Structures are given as C-alpha cells and as structure tokens.
Amino acid sequence: RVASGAGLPTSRQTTIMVTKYSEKSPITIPFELSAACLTYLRETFEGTI
Amino acid sequence: FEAIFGTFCNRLEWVYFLTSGLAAAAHAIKFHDLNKLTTGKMLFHVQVP
C-alpha cells in the first residue's frame, strides 16, 4: 500500500487471511495376473528344468 | 454303567509295484515332464534280406 494525501480514503487493513481448499483428483490403473502365472509362481515344482 | 474295552487298528497289506511279478513285464521309468507330453513315438526302419 501507498501513503496517501491529506484525507483521501485509503485502506486500514494488513494481512488478509484468505483460505484455499484442496481439490482432489485420484488416479487409477489395473494390472492383471492369470491362474497359470500364480500356479507356476508360488506352487513351485521340485521337478525338472 | 458303560465300559469301553479297547481300540484296535486294522493292519493293511501294503503292496508296491516293483515287488510284484507284473513289474517284470514293465520297464519302469520316472519322468516328471510327462504332463507336457502329448504323444511319444518310436519309428523303426528295416530292410528285408
């Protein structure tokens, strides 16, 4: 603000306290696995190569 | 007045393949990848005298 003249109407206030709210925006993406993949992943076989 | 005299267990006859006479007719092979196999083939090439 600027110091004004003799009696011109000017602002009194300092440090206005406006508040901002957050805007949400979730993001989503799926990934997939098949039954055979899980069978050969965890239930490992002590069999051959 | 009820009494329970005893608990008895049946002794089964454990039988194994390689101990039997029928095993003589069989050449015994253990091969884990059999689940993959579709059709095992043998092919002979003979020449008649």
PDB file of C-alpha atoms in Angstrom:
ATOM      1  CA  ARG A   1       0.000   0.000   0.000  1.00  0.00           C
ATOM      2  CA  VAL A   2       0.977   3.630  -0.528  1.00  0.00           C
ATOM      3  CA  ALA A   3       0.849   6.574   1.859  1.00  0.00           C
ATOM      4  CA  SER A   4      -1.850   8.902   0.536  1.00  0.00           C
ATOM      5  CA  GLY A   5      -2.610  12.618   0.702  1.00  0.00           C
ATOM      6  CA  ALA A   6      -4.370  14.857   3.214  1.00  0.00           C
ATOM      7  CA  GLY A   7      -7.560  12.891   3.824  1.00  0.00           C
ATOM      8  CA  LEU A   8      -8.180  10.609   0.858  1.00  0.00           C
ATOM      9  CA  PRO A   9      -9.968   7.352   1.786  1.00  0.00           C
ATOM     10  CA  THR A  10      -7.410   4.543   1.870  1.00  0.00           C
ATOM     11  CA  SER A  11      -7.218   1.060   3.344  1.00  0.00           C
ATOM     12  CA  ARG A  12      -6.612   0.354   7.030  1.00  0.00           C
ATOM     13  CA  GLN A  13      -6.040  -3.384   6.785  1.00  0.00           C
ATOM     14  CA  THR A  14      -2.930  -5.564   6.534  1.00  0.00           C
ATOM     15  CA  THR A  15      -2.537  -9.351   6.221  1.00  0.00           C
ATOM     16  CA  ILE A  16      -5.837 -10.561   4.785  1.00  0.00           C
ATOM     17  CA  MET A  17      -6.232 -14.242   5.605  1.00  0.00           C
ATOM     18  CA  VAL A  18      -7.876 -15.911   2.597  1.00  0.00           C
ATOM     19  CA  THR A  19      -8.044 -19.712   2.838  1.00  0.00           C
ATOM     20  CA  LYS A  20      -7.614 -22.220  -0.001  1.00  0.00           C
ATOM     21  CA  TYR A  21      -9.234 -25.655  -0.187  1.00  0.00           C
ATOM     22  CA  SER A  22      -7.605 -28.689  -1.777  1.00  0.00           C
ATOM     23  CA  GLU A  23      -9.033 -30.173  -4.970  1.00  0.00           C
ATOM     24  CA  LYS A  24      -8.926 -33.959  -5.252  1.00  0.00           C
ATOM     25  CA  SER A  25      -8.029 -35.988  -8.336  1.00  0.00           C
ATOM     26  CA  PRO A  26      -7.421 -39.718  -7.752  1.00  0.00           C
ATOM     27  CA  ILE A  27      -5.698 -41.761 -10.466  1.00  0.00           C
ATOM     28  CA  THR A  28      -6.363 -45.444 -11.176  1.00  0.00           C
ATOM     29  CA  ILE A  29      -4.832 -48.209 -13.298  1.00  0.00           C
ATOM     30  CA  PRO A  30      -5.384 -52.008 -13.174  1.00  0.00           C
ATOM     31  CA  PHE A  31      -2.841 -54.802 -13.652  1.00  0.00           C
ATOM     32  CA  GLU A  32      -3.720 -58.465 -14.061  1.00  0.00           C
ATOM     33  CA  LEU A  33      -2.309 -61.942 -13.420  1.00  0.00           C
ATOM     34  CA  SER A  34      -3.626 -65.309 -14.608  1.00  0.00           C
ATOM     35  CA  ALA A  35      -4.208 -68.546 -12.709  1.00  0.00           C
ATOM     36  CA  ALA A  36      -1.376 -70.328 -14.539  1.00  0.00           C
ATOM     37  CA  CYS A  37       1.008 -67.499 -13.633  1.00  0.00           C
ATOM     38  CA  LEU A  38       0.161 -67.837  -9.936  1.00  0.00           C
ATOM     39  CA  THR A  39       0.356 -71.643 -10.143  1.00  0.00           C
ATOM     40  CA  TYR A  40       3.865 -71.538 -11.618  1.00  0.00           C
ATOM     41  CA  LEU A  41       4.947 -68.628  -9.397  1.00  0.00           C
ATOM     42  CA  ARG A  42       4.223 -69.789  -5.833  1.00  0.00           C
ATOM     43  CA  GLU A  43       3.477 -73.531  -6.069  1.00  0.00           C
ATOM     44  CA  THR A  44       6.942 -74.199  -7.442  1.00  0.00           C
ATOM     45  CA  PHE A  45       7.660 -77.765  -8.546  1.00  0.00           C
ATOM     46  CA  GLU A  46      10.811 -79.609  -7.434  1.00  0.00           C
ATOM     47  CA  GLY A  47      10.725 -81.221 -10.885  1.00  0.00           C
ATOM     48  CA  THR A  48      12.949 -80.747 -13.926  1.00  0.00           C
ATOM     49  CA  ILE A  49      14.267 -77.761 -15.878  1.00  0.00           C
TER      50      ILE A  49
ATOM     51  CA  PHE B   1     -22.542 -98.284  33.788  1.00  0.00           C
ATOM     52  CA  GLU B   2     -20.799 -98.349  30.400  1.00  0.00           C
ATOM     53  CA  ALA B   3     -17.237 -99.524  29.766  1.00  0.00           C
ATOM     54  CA  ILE B   4     -15.228 -99.101  26.554  1.00  0.00           C
ATOM     55  CA  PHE B   5     -12.804-102.016  26.467  1.00  0.00           C
ATOM     56  CA  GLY B   6     -10.235-101.092  23.808  1.00  0.00           C
ATOM     57  CA  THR B   7      -9.466 -99.550  20.428  1.00  0.00           C
ATOM     58  CA  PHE B   8      -7.862-101.759  17.768  1.00  0.00           C
ATOM     59  CA  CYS B   9      -6.481-100.853  14.337  1.00  0.00           C
ATOM     60  CA  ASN B  10      -6.569-102.890  11.127  1.00  0.00           C
ATOM     61  CA  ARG B  11      -3.144-103.798   9.725  1.00  0.00           C
ATOM     62  CA  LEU B  12      -3.437-103.231   5.978  1.00  0.00           C
ATOM     63  CA  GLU B  13      -1.291-105.096   3.459  1.00  0.00           C
ATOM     64  CA  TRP B  14       0.981-102.511   1.845  1.00  0.00           C
ATOM     65  CA  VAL B  15       1.738-103.513  -1.754  1.00  0.00           C
ATOM     66  CA  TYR B  16       4.290-101.959  -4.117  1.00  0.00           C
ATOM     67  CA  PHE B  17       4.669-102.148  -7.896  1.00  0.00           C
ATOM     68  CA  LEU B  18       8.328-103.147  -8.208  1.00  0.00           C
ATOM     69  CA  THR B  19       7.824-106.019  -5.747  1.00  0.00           C
ATOM     70  CA  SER B  20       5.185-107.696  -7.942  1.00  0.00           C
ATOM     71  CA  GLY B  21       5.719-110.173 -10.757  1.00  0.00           C
ATOM     72  CA  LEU B  22       3.772-107.935 -13.131  1.00  0.00           C
ATOM     73  CA  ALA B  23       6.644-105.446 -12.792  1.00  0.00           C
ATOM     74  CA  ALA B  24       8.790-107.859 -14.819  1.00  0.00           C
ATOM     75  CA  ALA B  25       6.735-107.102 -17.936  1.00  0.00           C
ATOM     76  CA  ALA B  26       7.259-103.362 -17.360  1.00  0.00           C
ATOM     77  CA  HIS B  27      10.348-101.242 -17.869  1.00  0.00           C
ATOM     78  CA  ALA B  28       9.811 -98.705 -15.089  1.00  0.00           C
ATOM     79  CA  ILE B  29      10.578 -95.066 -15.924  1.00  0.00           C
ATOM     80  CA  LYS B  30      10.078 -91.961 -13.782  1.00  0.00           C
ATOM     81  CA  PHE B  31       9.840 -88.762 -15.832  1.00  0.00           C
ATOM     82  CA  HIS B  32       8.347 -85.629 -14.281  1.00  0.00           C
ATOM     83  CA  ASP B  33       7.621 -83.750 -17.527  1.00  0.00           C
ATOM     84  CA  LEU B  34       5.008 -86.365 -18.532  1.00  0.00           C
ATOM     85  CA  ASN B  35       2.261 -83.767 -18.040  1.00  0.00           C
ATOM     86  CA  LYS B  36       3.694 -81.871 -21.018  1.00  0.00           C
ATOM     87  CA  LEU B  37       3.987 -84.908 -23.300  1.00  0.00           C
ATOM     88  CA  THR B  38       1.277 -85.335 -25.948  1.00  0.00           C
ATOM     89  CA  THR B  39       2.316 -88.477 -27.852  1.00  0.00           C
ATOM     90  CA  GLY B  40       5.618 -90.333 -27.576  1.00  0.00           C
ATOM     91  CA  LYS B  41       6.555 -92.197 -30.743  1.00  0.00           C
ATOM     92  CA  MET B  42       9.131 -94.749 -31.843  1.00  0.00           C
ATOM     93  CA  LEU B  43       9.810 -95.369 -35.530  1.00  0.00           C
ATOM     94  CA  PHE B  44      11.785 -98.277 -36.988  1.00  0.00           C
ATOM     95  CA  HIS B  45      13.442 -98.538 -40.410  1.00  0.00           C
ATOM     96  CA  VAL B  46      14.032-102.126 -41.537  1.00  0.00           C
ATOM     97  CA  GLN B  47      15.490-103.692 -44.674  1.00  0.00           C
ATOM     98  CA  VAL B  48      14.322-107.167 -45.686  1.00  0.00           C
ATOM     99  CA  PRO B  49      17.037-109.628 -46.785  1.00  0.00           C
TER     100      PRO B  49
END
